[PDB]
Amino acid sequence: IANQFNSAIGKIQDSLSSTASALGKLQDVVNQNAQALNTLVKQLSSNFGAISSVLNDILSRLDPPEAEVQIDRLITGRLQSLQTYVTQQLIRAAEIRASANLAATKMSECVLGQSKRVDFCGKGYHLMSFPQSAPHGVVFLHVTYVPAQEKNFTTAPAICHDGKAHFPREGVFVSNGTHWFVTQRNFYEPQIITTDNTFVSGNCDVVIGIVNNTVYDPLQPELDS
Amino acid sequence: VSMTKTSVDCTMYICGDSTECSNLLLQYGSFCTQLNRALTGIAVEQDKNTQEVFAQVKQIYKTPPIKDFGGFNFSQILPDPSKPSKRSFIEDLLFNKVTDLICAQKFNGLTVLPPLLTDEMIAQYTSALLAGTITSGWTFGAGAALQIPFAMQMAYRFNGIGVTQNVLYENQKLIANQFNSAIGKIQDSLSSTASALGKLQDVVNQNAQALNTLVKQLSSNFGAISSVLNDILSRLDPPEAEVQIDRLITGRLQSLQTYVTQQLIRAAEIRASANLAATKMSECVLGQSKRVDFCGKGYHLMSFPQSAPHGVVFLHVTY
Amino acid sequence: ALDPLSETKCTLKSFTVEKGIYQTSNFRVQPTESIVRFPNITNLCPFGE
Amino acid sequence: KNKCVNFNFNGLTGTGVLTESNKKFLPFQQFGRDIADTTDAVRDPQTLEILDITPCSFGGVSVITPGTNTSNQVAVLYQDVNCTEVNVFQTRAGCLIGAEHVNNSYECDIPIGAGICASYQTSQSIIAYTMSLGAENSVAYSNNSIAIPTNFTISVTTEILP
């Protein structure tokens, strides 16, 4: 597990070093902010129907009355530009605030404790997460348990030993063709079927698909001793 | 999940069939380009929402021809290959119960960009997710697909909510009838009640109203002698025609800016809704969620998504 | 106006075009000829009065 | 008729395509309007006949090109319009030129529309193909069979949120 974790960390390091598009999510915010700032700055060059786009040029050419009309047009244009920029900034800030609340939840759940939410901390069963400081954002290294290899095995919902159905307490019953063994869904580790690992409910005539097998009794060797 | 994709041509919409009007827009400068880019970004964000919500796996799953799920009848939710477009019986009402204007809007500069993902492909994504849930349960989204009988999947889901799975194998016959009755009741309610999809109908109505208002604002005088650029060009001299066209451009640009701002706000709302839908798909549909009432009233067991126009409908199974 | 690449470069105001799809402008159709149809009136208005 | 021309009818000036109209106007009605209230159809003052007015410039134009550092090849996409002016192909998104249609489905590289994506792949050129939904996997389903993983790998997933 430690070797796999180290290999994954090294792979992430190499991908970040080579592929810069991995941070494209923050690059998009940076590019949008830069584009908005550049557009707002450039709008100062727009005439907006006035004779000139420079306030000083208008002030140095026309009389106070005509200069007033020209400056009124210029101010209307610049105020519209400012209002559009502020609206775009407010919308982007609301989006980034929603993302920041999501990131705070992601931290509090994944990193601090353990999160049972599916895919909230990333694909696979989550174990822990490691935040990483990034410009105008944060990068999370999500550690998850992903099964690699699987093999099909015969299973049965219950075991019929003495006419009373036995159900797993945890995991599932599996068989490789020799005997029925107990293992968890997420991992393969056969265990001897026994009362401590099961419980008695119903009967063998109610459960559908039940099979017959011997259930080990831990008290049997002790009682005979 | 997704909002109607519209790419309003700020050039054609205002200065359609006018050259002096375009020259005047050049004086204003970057508003036209900024609005076009904002609408393109809105479309891109809607496509991203669709991809993030509908696509949760890297593979496509199909149910076997022989189906033995312990009594449940998923034919209502599963796709029907006989139809010209793959879809389930429930999806028929979802698409049919949600609603020329399009040609008129297009002639006015309102370009309706088709979604990057077609309804047929949305149906295929839904079918793949349903097949994964039915066969592999919650294991197909967490890694390599693991085949598990549906009865044992329900047993584990009951164990996760505090109900011992022994109840399942005892009630397997009655629970099948309960689920079938619930599915039939949902089908009947959707067929009779067209307001069930009112949530998506509201989004459709908002988009239609915004587009109609934007189109109608063209006919408004906006303080000018006439609302038609051609009439101004054929009536007034370049000096006065320019003043009238400037008034019309100011009015139409204010209308378009208001439309774009409101559409961006609606797109933010749709993005929040799509994030919620993706979270629900990941938790309720793919796996199991312990969140109370997040997947619906009662103790959630599993959810079966269904495709709807400009959105998605989730069938949440609860105890 | 040389090729679609140059049009995209001008639209983006940059010579570096990232991979993807971009919208530059609309599809324009120039009118073939000017058509005039007016009512047939052979009487001049009475400007004398 | 059947051509984009600049028309001046009864003092109304505009650009559009003139075609025979299937709409029936009343004897007194002369000027028709669409849903948007713009010009829809008019009656010729000399020879009474209804002509539909369709504004020209159908659809839009889009450019599909890869990174300039890779190649300068481009493909022009016309939105919701068939190939009129014009490697001339058609797809769900409209007339597409400069891209080679390929039946094989691949991962979406450059979105086109209506489930169509384009990519620059092999002596390489832009191609058009149906968007791939992922590798097709058929998981066997049986009541008595289950899959229990025999091995596991701990992987770290990189996620970025502003």
What HEC string does chain A produce?
CHHHHHHHHHHHHHHHHHCHHHHHHHHHHHHHHHHHHHHHHHHHHCCCCCCCCCHHHHHCCCCHHHHHHHHHHHHHHHHHHHHHHHHHHHHHHHHHHHHHHHHHHHHHHHHHCCCCCCCCCCCCEEEEEEEEEECCEEEEEEEEEEEEEEEEEEECCCEECCCCEEEECCCEEEECCCCEEEECCCCCCCEECEHHHEEECCCCCCCCCCEECCCECCHHHHHHC
Closest residue, chain B, to D6 (C-alpha) = B17
Whether residue D119 contacts residue D129, with contact meaning beta carbons closer than 8 Å, is answered with yes
Q: How far apart are CA D14 and CA B316, in angstroms?
A: 56
* Exposure on the CB side of residue A95, measured as CA atoms within 13 A: 25
Do the Cβ atoms of A8 and D148 come within 8 Å? no
Distance CA A64, CA B149 (A): 86
B155 and chain D: CB distance < 8 Å anywhere? no
B181-214 in b/e burial notation, b at 16+ Cβ within 10 A?
A: eebeebbeebeeeeebbeebbebbebbeebbbeb
Burial-class residue D138 by CB neighbours within 10 Å (0-12, 13-18, 19+). Answer: middle
Q: Is D137 on the interface with B (CB under 8 A)?
A: yes
Q: Does C1 touch chain D (CB under 8 A)?
A: no
Edge-first strand listing for the sheet containing D125-130: D100-101, D125-130, D116-121, D110-113
Nearest chain C alpha carbon to B110 = C26
- In the Cβ-directed half-sphere of D82, how many Cα atoms lie within 13 Å? 1
Contact A201 B166 (CB under 8 A): yes
CA B192, CA D10: separation in Å to the nearest integer? 53
Q: What span, in angstroms and rounded, lies between the C-alpha atoms of B191 and B96? A: 10
Nearest partner of C7 among A136, A137, D60, judged by Cα:
D60
Greatest C-alpha distance within chain D: 88
B144, HSE (Cβ side, Cα atoms, 13 Å): 18
Per DSSP, chain D holds a count of helices (H) and strands (E) of: 0, 15
From residue D137, how far is each of B139, B146, B294, B306 by CA, in Å? Answer: 14, 12, 31, 21
Supply angle C-alpha A116, B69, B177, rounded to 5: 100
Nearest CA in chain B to A164: B166
CB B144 within 8 A of CB D142: no
Which residue, among A143, A147, A109, A107, has the nearest Cα to A127 in the 3D structure?
A143
Q: Provide the H-helix boundaries in B142-237.
A: 150-160, 166-192, 198-216, 229-235
d(CA C7, CA C24): 7
Q: Do D98 and C4 touch (CB under 8 A)?
A: yes
Quote the DSSP letter at residue B114.
P
- Is B44 within 8 Å of B6 (Cβ atoms)? no
Report the distance separating Cα A180 and Cα A174, nearest Å: 6
Q: Any CB–CB contact under 8 A between B269 and chain D?
A: no
> What residues pair up with D61 in beta bridges, in sequence order?
D78
CB neighbours of D85 closer than 8 A, spacing ≥ 6? Answer: none
Provide the 3-class DSSP secondary structure of residue B288.
coil
Residue B17 is nearest to which of D14, D114, D149, comparing CB atoms?
D14
Cβ neighbours of residue B129 closer than 8 Å, sequence gap 6 or more: B56, B57, B61, B281, B285, B286, B305
Q: Does C2 touch chain D (CB under 8 A)?
A: no
Q: Tell me if B117 sits within 8 A of B54, measured CB to CB.
A: yes
Residue type for position D44: D
Size of chain D, expressed as the number of residues it contains: 162
Q: How far is CA D53 from CA A174, B235, D5, in A?
A: 74, 22, 10
CA distance B142 to A120: 12
Residues 2-21 of chain D whose Cβ lies under 8 A from any Cβ of chain B: 11-15
The torsion region of residue A146 among left (phi > 0), alpha (psi -120 to 50) and beta comes to beta
Closest CA to C26 of B108, A24, B283: B108
Cα separation, D42 vs D20, whole angstroms: 11
List CB contacts (< 8 A) between D36 and chain B.
Answer: 104-105, 107-108, 215-216, 218-219
Residue of chain C nearest D70, judged by CA positions: C19
The single-letter code of the amino acid at B232 is I
What whole-number distance in Å separates Cα of residue B285 and Cα of residue B242?
A: 60
Q: What's the CA gap between B139 and A186, in Å, rounded? A: 9
Please state the separation of Cα D116 from the chain's center in Å. Answer: 10
Residue B44, H or E segment = helix B31-54
Q: Shortest CA distance to B289 belongs to which of B270, B314, B308, B310?
A: B314
Could A8 and D145 be called an inter-chain contact, meaning their C-beta atoms sit closer than 8 Å?
Answer: no
Six-digit token pair at A42?
A: 């450039």
